[PDB]
Structure formats: C-alpha cells, structure tokens
Design a binder for this molecule. Structure first.
Ligand SMILES: [Cl-]
Ligand code: NA
Ligand code: NA
Ligand SMILES: [Zn+2]
Ligand SMILES: [Zn+2]
Lengths: 665, 6
C-alpha cells in the first residue's frame, strides 16, 4: 500500500560474499531471459505490453536487485564483502553494456515508436521511447556491425578502468607518523584521538577527518607539506596508468560515434548543451573573480610573512599548496571572527539532525519518523520513514551513515537504493536513499560536534536525499535524481542556503553543555562570512572544471601538467611538483567526466530560485516550499531540467542572483 | 551515485 511501509523496503544487508556472487549470476540469467524474449518477438508483433512494458518491468526489478550487490563495496566493514560487491559491479557493468547494445531490442523499440499512436500513451512513456532510441544511437546501434563491436569492447574496458580507479582510492591506507611537536597548534581533542606508535608519536591517515584539520590548523609547515604530498600522490602509479588508457579510450569511442571530443559527447545530455557554452561560462566567471583572487593572495602572503617572522621560519615568498587552507582559515578567524572549533560546540549532531528534519517538515510538508531495530549494514546506521504530512502517503525511507570507519566511502555522497517508480502490478515502489558522510566522531567525553562546514555538507547531501524521496515517476530510469548531471546539484546546493540564515541557524544550534544559543553578534558574523575566501575557493573549482574539460577535449595531454597549468594561470597557487591531483580525481571515474563544471552551473539555478522566490517571500513559506517539491523534486527525470526551472520561476533563469551572492557585478 | 565538490 502507498500508505504502509512493511514489506516495501526489499533491501537486505546480510549477504555473504558467496551469496553476493550467487545472486549476481542469478540476476544476470533472469534479466537476460526478459531481453531474449523481447528480442525473439517478430518486429510486426511488438506491442506496448510485450515490449515497452516488459522492458520497463525488468529495469526496475534489475536496478533494485543490483543495489544490494554493488552498494556494499561502499559501506560494508567486511573487506571480503566489499571485494565481492566490487566484482559484482564489474560483472553487472559488463552485462549492462551487453544488453544496452542489443540491436534486436533497438530495432523493436524504434518500430514501436513509429507504429504506435503516441497520442494515446502517457507523455513519460513517449519520453521513455525517445530517450531509449537516443541512448541506442549514443551506443552506435545505427552504425555498422564491426564499429558496434569495437565500441562494445572499448566500453567494457572503460567500465573496469573506472571501477578500479575508485576502488584503488577507496581501499588506500596511506598513513604518516608525526610527533607531538610536529603537530603543533592542533587541539588536544584531535591529538588524543590518534593511535600512538612505539616512539610515542601519532599515526595520521589521509582520511578527510585527519587531512583537513592538519591542513587548516597545524602551524608546522613541514607537517602540512608532507601531508599535501601524500594526499596528492595517492595511487599515483596505478591511477596514472588507468588515466593513460581511459582518456584515449573515451576519445576513440566519441570519434566512432561522430563526436569530435568526449566532452562534446557528454555535454549533449546536459542543460549546458555544448562545450563552447561551458568554456564561456567558466572563462567569464574566472575573469570576474580575478581581482578577488589577487586581493586574497596578497592578504595570505602578508599572513605567511608575519607568521614566519614571529615563529622564526624561513620565508620563501610564495603560497604553496600546503599553505592555502591554513591561511584561508586564518582569514576567516581574523576578518570575520569565526573560530570553527568554538562554533562547533553549538552544533551537536543530534541537534543538527533534529533541526534539519524539522526544516523539511515545515517547508515541504513532510513527516519523519526514526525506525527502531532497523535492518542496517552497520550498527551506527539509522533509518527514517518519510510521509506526506497531509495525506499520510509513505514516500520513502532514508538511511543515515554519518561517521567514518575502515573501508567506508571517504567522501560525502547520496545513494539511490530504490526508485520511487511504478511496479508491474500497478502499485508504486517506495523510494529508498542513503546519506553517506564522514563527520567528526564523539571525542573527549562530548557528543559529535559539527563544524559549520560539516553542517553545510549535511544539508547538501540531505537535499539529494529528499530529491530521491520526493521524486515519483512511472519509469525507474527517470526516477529520483536521474536528471541532467549539470542539474542534479540544484537541490543539494539549494538546501545549503538554510545554513546561511540567522533565524534558521538559531533553530539548528544549541550549546552541547549549557544548551544556550549562539550569541546574536556571532550569528550575524557567521552569515556575513559566507563570502570569505570566495575568490580563491571558487577559482579552485574553476581549475578543476577546466582540467576536466581539457582532459576530455585534447588527446595527448599529460594530466598532471594540465592541472599544474591551470593552477598557475587561474588559481595562482602552484601545484606541488611530483604530485598528480588528477590521479586522485574520483569524479573523473564516477560519472562526472567532462561534467565537473556542473556544480558551478547548477549554483546559478539554485541561487536564482533561492533569491527570487524563497528569500523574496520568506524562506520558510510552506506555499513556496510545496511549489518547490512539486515542480523541481517530484518530476525527477521525467522532465527536462530547464523545463522544471521555467515552471518554478515562470521565466528563464539568469545570473543576477548568482553574481549578487558572490559580491560581483 | 551523487558526489560533493572536491
Ligand atoms: Cl513491494
Ligand atoms: Na606551536
Ligand atoms: Na516563485
Ligand atoms: Zn549559466
Ligand atoms: Zn552533490
């Protein structure tokens, strides 16, 4: 039932390595049985029911069963489970390529769209047909046989290269050893949490909860330098080899399909449409940010020169890679009176979660309830049920996986586990999502205390979760967050705006010790500090966007050299010689290839919606909130991103709000 | 899956 929850979450998280392998073979056999049956149909015998409906039914059945197999590699604490899950992902990704390139299927869906009366089927079904045919041409199914075979074998090679690229980074266990003196300025609650060695030193890993505090707060330059070198040389050997194969393969496939570059090939499926639009966007934004970057670099150099003189260090007259975050942190403290280590005392994780849940309850008309004795993949994971406040309809469930551990995905991500689409029997499947982050653990007898940047990350990822939960479509391939890549960051970045509002922040904060609120003056300073370091922080994202475009545009380019080029020309902070940042650039292998610009691209849309609608009429207005759910989240991928933006804004978007929020124009 | 900025 749409108003119940029992039995609607069919996910199991107690699979052994052997069961993962057995289930993978069973899923492939049963799924191939459906594609074979459709392929055996006479071309003049195909109908909506025996062809379109049959393929739609197997897509939802397959994607849900696939989740139980390919998700544990990201979260399971058992390394053998993670390894079996990775092997299942490799095998199922090759199987996905085989089925996607069946000419008999492509021939029959093409014949269905040409013969059936499109006017008498739902618009999302017409979208299913045209997108399916478009995907077929993007797989070369309209091309001769031997070029299809060449594309297939290359796509199979690329799927394993991408999986290995991220597997290497996920299982890396690099660590460094530092003495207490070498960890100067770092607080005791951080130091007293590290493992000690036989020489009374401390082991520090390259995980974010270790790397970031060292780079932001450690006053020993050599300590920051050794960490930056290790962080930007993770998997240097093996992942450079992967890039040296993956990037030419992407180019050669795009050429066979008729595109000049891989960047052109992927841009066609995004709202930006073309690479020349991306270049003009990044290049014009870079020029507007140039004066801010110069002023910020000047101030940082003055900070470093004074500290070197005070601490008696050598001064090299430049901003090294291992200096940037450290002096950006000082800029925040000095110019805006923001001490992140003091401010986190007001963000205990339970208060932040409570206020985050209450924000969506009041704004989007939803109800949240934590499930007790939930079936989860790790003891620290919690499960929540989402209902529509007015009707009681059970929209979905989401898991919260908030703390780091061995073998867990290091970054911050949202995972779609069940699509909120229609089932073969006509009923609606309950959507399921998982929020996976690595927040500071409880230490020193205190609850987990989140820095404001961790609260913003929490809100960012929860925006993805609610997009997955609120989206309801007929077909699984349009469900949840299956929108354009340069559009999927709109709901995530939209929610971040609620951590930069005074009244909202007052509701999210409560001192862990005496329950007192953040002082009014400090709240005003926190909100006004939103643009601190924005020049170099944004220019760094432009560097990443430019490197991503270039590595998928020019063919015979050294990725490390191309990164170093844009670091000097755009950011003004040289890349450390000997490092290879692109070899750690997981986005290049995680579906963001040629599309990393999408973060900045999405921010223009989210800022326009927040300023023009929410801020103009109250950012807690439930009427504007419900309009946002129905027009932006609920359609999922069943509508074009620009169409949903136009429905919400009632006009075309522009950069006025985006530029105004950056202190530009 | 969906990722945050690097
Ligand atoms: Cl069910
Ligand atoms: Na010191
Ligand atoms: Na509006
Ligand atoms: Zn734009
Ligand atoms: Zn994201």
């Amino acid at each position: 039932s749409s108003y119940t929850v029992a039995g609607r979450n069919v996910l199991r998280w107690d699979l052994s390595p052997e069961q993962i392998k057995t289930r993978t073979e069973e899923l492939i056999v049963q799924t191939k049985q459906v594609y074979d049956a459709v392929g055996m149909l006479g071309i003049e015998e195909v109908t909506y029911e025996n062809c379109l409906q049959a393929l739609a039914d197997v897509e939802v059945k397959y994607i849900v069963e696939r989740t139980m197999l390919d998700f544990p590699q990201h979260v399971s604490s058992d390394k053998e489970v993670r390894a079996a899950s990775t092997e299942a992902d490799k095998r199922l990704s090759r199987f996905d390529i085989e089925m996607s390139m069946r000419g008999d299927i492509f021939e029959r869906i093409v014949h269905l769209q040409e013969t059936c009366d499109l006017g008498k089927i739902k618009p999302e079904a017409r979208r299913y047909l045209e997108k399916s045919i478009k995907m077929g041409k993007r797989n070369g199914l309209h091309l001769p046989e031997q070029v299809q075979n060449e594309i297939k074998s290359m796509k199979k090679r690329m799927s394993e290269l991408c999986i290995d690229f991220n597997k290497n980074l996920n299982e890396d266990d690099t660590f460094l050893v530092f003495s207490k003196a070498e960890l100067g300025a770092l607080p005791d609650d951080f130091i007293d949490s590290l493992e000690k060695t036989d020489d009374d030193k401390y082991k520090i890993t390259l995980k974010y909860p270790h790397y970031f505090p060292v780079m932001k707060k450690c006053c020993i330059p050599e300590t920051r330098r050794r960490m930056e070198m290790a962080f930007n040389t993770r998997c240097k050997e093996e992942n450079t080899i992967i890039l040296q194969q993956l990037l030419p393969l992407r180019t050669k496939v795009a050429k066979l399909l008729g595109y000049s570059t891989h960047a052109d090939f992927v841009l066609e499926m995004n709202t930006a449409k073309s690479t020349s639009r991306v270049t003009a966007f990044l290049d014009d934004l870079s020029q507007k940010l140039k004066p801010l970057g110069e002023a910020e670099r000047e101030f940082i150099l003055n900070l470093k020169k004074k500290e070197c003189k005070d601490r008696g260090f050598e001064y090299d007259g430049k901003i090294n890679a291992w200096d940037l975050y450290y002096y950006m942190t000082q800029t925040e403290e000095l110019k805006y009176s923001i001490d992140q280590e003091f401010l986190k005392e007001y963000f205990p994780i339970e208060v932040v979660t409570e206020g985050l849940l209450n924000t969506y309850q009041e704004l989007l008309g939803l109800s949240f309830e934590q499930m007790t004795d939930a079936h989860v993949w790790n003891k620290s994971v919690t499960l929540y049920t989402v209902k529509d406040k007015a009707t009681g309809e059970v929209l979905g469930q989401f898991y919260l996986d908030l703390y780091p551990r061995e073998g867990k995905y290091n970054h911050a991500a949202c995972f779609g586990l069940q699509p909120g689409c229609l089932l073969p029997d006509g009923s609606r499947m309950m959507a399921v999502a998982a929020l996976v982050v690595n927040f500071s653990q409880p230490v020193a007898g205190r609850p987990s205390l989140l820095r404001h940047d961790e609260v913003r990350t929490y809100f960012h990822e929860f925006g993805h979760v609610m997009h997955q939960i609120c989206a309801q479509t007929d077909f699984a391939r349009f469900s949840g967050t299956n929108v354009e890549t340069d559009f999927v960051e709109v709901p995530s970045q939209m929610l971040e705006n609620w951590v930069w509002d005074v009244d909202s922040l007052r509701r999210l904060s409560k001192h862990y010790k005496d329950g007192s609120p953040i002082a009014d003056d400090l709240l005003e300073k926190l909100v006004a500090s939103r643009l601190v370091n924005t020049g170099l922080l944004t220019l760094r994202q432009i560097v990443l966007s430019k490197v991503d475009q270039s590595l998928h545009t020019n063919t015979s380019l050294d990725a490390a050299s191309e990164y170093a080029k844009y670091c000097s020309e755009i950011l003004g902070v040289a890349a450390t010689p000997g490092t290879n940042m692109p070899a750690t650039f997981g986005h290049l292998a995680g579906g963001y290839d040629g599309q990393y610009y999408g973060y900045l691209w999405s921010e223009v849309f989210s800022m326009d919606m927040f300023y023009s609608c929410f801020k103009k009429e109250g950012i807690m207005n439930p009427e504007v909130g419900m309009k946002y759910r129905n027009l932006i989240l609920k359609p999922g991928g069943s509508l074009d991103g620009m169409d949903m933006l136009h429905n919400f804004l009632k006009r075309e978007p522009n950069q006025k709000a985006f530029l105004m929020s950056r202190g530009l124009h | 899956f969906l990722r945050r900025i690097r």
